[PDB]
Structure 1
Amino acid sequence: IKQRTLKRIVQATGVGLHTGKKVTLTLRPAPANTGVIYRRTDLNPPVDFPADAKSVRDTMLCTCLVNEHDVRISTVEHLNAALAGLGIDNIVIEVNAPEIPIMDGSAAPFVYLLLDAGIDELNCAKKFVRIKETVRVEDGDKWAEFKPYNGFSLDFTIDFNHPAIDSSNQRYAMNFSADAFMRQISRARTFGFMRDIEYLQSRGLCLGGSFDCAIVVDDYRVLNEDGLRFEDEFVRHKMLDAIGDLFMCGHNIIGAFTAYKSGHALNNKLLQAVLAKQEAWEYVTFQDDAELPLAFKAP
């Protein structure tokens, strides 16, 4: 019902999945109506990237923020999913490199870092995007849609034809809440095929890839010694990505998200399509937290 930021400043270091470059990440309290601001500090003067759906590029196997001249910060979807998780509206994210550190491949280390910084509630009203019409976008056999619904629901179906990713759980559905996100989604790691690593590293992608930040799968199985944190970790990670992608507008959404084989590109195309239709959505604030959907009760 009230907007949110951090109580104090926290730092973590790590490496960029794509660049291999060492990075330090600084999260910063920000006053009301600031929004979500990414900032590169390896550049002087430092360059600000406000989170906006029109500022997304989809080309580098992840979600990148870019300005009008294609200067960029890569691999924002995992930290962004953590901000969506804990309802954070106003924050400054500083990196001294062109990319967010990958940490353990999931959103959980971002969740711990934000909880250690404590959440500060503000005396100004948190704005929600309420979906007021069905919108649908497509790409081959891939599709993604939003529908009006008095909460926040995600229904995600993947189709990977691969023995190590059993069909039995290539679909996942949840009603969103900070606690659910934290218990069911936040610890789901990124993954990659051993068959792809030569190609991707020859192009300057996944240079920071390790068994520490990813599930590695060969032609038959998961190679990681300790296996999976969940039998369906693959589709939970795809849903983590989708939550990060939908928060590029900088507001939690009131709606029912459904997707088949969607990714960064189609998830942004959906988010954009919605915001381009004046009549498909509406801001809404909450005077009393009685009318506020259970999806957004504080953690």
Structure 2
Amino acid sequence: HHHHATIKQRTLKNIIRATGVGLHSGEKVYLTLKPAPVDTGIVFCRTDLDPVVEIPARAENVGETTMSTTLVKGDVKVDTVEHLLSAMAGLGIDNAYVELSASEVPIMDGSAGPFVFLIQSAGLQEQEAAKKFVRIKREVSVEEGDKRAVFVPFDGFKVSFEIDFDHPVFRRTQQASVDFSSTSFVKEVSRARTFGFMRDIEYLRSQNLALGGSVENAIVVDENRVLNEDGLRYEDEFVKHKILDAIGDLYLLGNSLIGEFRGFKSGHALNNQLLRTLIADKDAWEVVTFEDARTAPISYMRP
């Protein structure tokens, strides 16, 4: 028959298994993504510990936001969740358990591409409960110096980002806007790899960071050019990756957004400051569901 269909929560149809290396720790890590019940959200599970330590991927659990987005509970951390969370958000996955055998999510090829491929191969499962969205109803802005991150009301979901690197590799706009109620996360953004400049990578290594980085999982830039012999996947890959990171960091809200995000030189730390300010300002957002997908401002691929 023909009639209104609620937009439903989604989990995984099948389990996903992957093995990789942490970008910063260099450690080998085994990843298992599992389906989860309605209203679970995304939950990270350190299965190398006894007992297993579980950390919901929510803004309140964000520890340090230095080089990557890190979740903390007591003395236990899960590092670099942003790229996997970007894949979850981009495919509309509400509920899943993410089991990790080590403290850091594997970096894969530096983008969300391998995650979206593994998830879409396994397939998604719609669940018998309405999907909840957080709708921006007032402008919310956080700044620190010359960095800015803002939420604005928008009947859809749209992310804009601008970076301002003074570096010969950008002699480029350093700006991109993507409307995901219109274009596709998989198409526009998922394949954008992380990047680092050699000067900063050298410092990071001296601090026991970036230990797993290489041309196999990152765009590596020296003082003048990209060192990866096979080049860039997009002419604006750097700023597309900033958008990927933003989508992942924003999914620490625990629900998909109906609104617009605008980032100027933002990063994990300011992104999370923006989420904490939004959450505290309950006049600026509300939780909504859609009983008829045909009238909703957002749509999703077939599962």
Report the TM-score range of the alignment, normalised by the length of the smaller protein.
over 0.9
Does the CA-based 8 Å contact 2:66-2:268 persist in structure 1?
A: no
Shift of 1:70: 4.0
Overall identity of the aligned pairs, in %: 58
Q: Partner residue of 1:55?
A: 61
Q: How far apart are residue 291 of structure 1 and its match?
A: 2.4
Q: Show CA shifts across 1:168-193 (max 9, x none).
A: 22000010159621111000001011
Counterpart in 2 of 1:296?
A: 299
> What is the alpha-carbon distance in structure 1 between the residues aligned to residue 141 and residue 183 of structure 2?
29
Q: TM-score, normalised by structure 1?
A: 0.96
Rounded Cα–Cα distance in structure 2 between residues aligned with 1:105 and 1:39? 22
8 Å CA contact 2:87–2:116 kept in 1: the answer is yes
**What is the TM-score when the length of structure 2 is the normalising length?**
0.95
Answer yes or no: is 1:218 the counterpart of 2:222.
yes
Would you say 1:81 and 2:86 are equivalent positions? yes
Which blocks of at least 5 consecutive residues in structure 2 are unaligned? Answer: 1-6
**Which residue identity is paired with 1:240?**
L
Which residue of structure 2 aligns with residue 155 of structure 1? 160
Q: How does 1:1-299 map to 2 (within 5 A)?
A: 1-67=7-73, 69-166=74-171, 168-177=172-181, 180-293=184-297, 295-299=298-302
Query: For residues 155 and 179 of structure 1, do their structure 2 counterparts lie closer, same or farther at Cα, with a shift above 3 Å needed?
Result: closer
Query: Are residues 188 and 178 of structure 1, via their aligned partners in 2, closer, same or farther at CA, if it must alter by over 3 Å?
Result: farther
User: Unpaired runs of 5+ in structure 1?
Assistant: none
Q: CA shift at 1:223, angstroms?
A: 0.8
CA contact (8 A) 1:60 1:205 kept: no
Moved segments of 4+, more than 3 Å: none
Change (3 A) 1:86 1:178: farther
Residues 119/267 of structure 1: CA separation in 2 closer, same or farther (3 Å cut): same
Q: CA RMSD in A?
A: 1.2
Amino acid at match of 2:34: R
d(CA) in 2 for partners of 1:179, 1:97: 35
Q: In the aligned structure 1, how far is the partner of 2:112 from the partner of 2:159?
A: 17
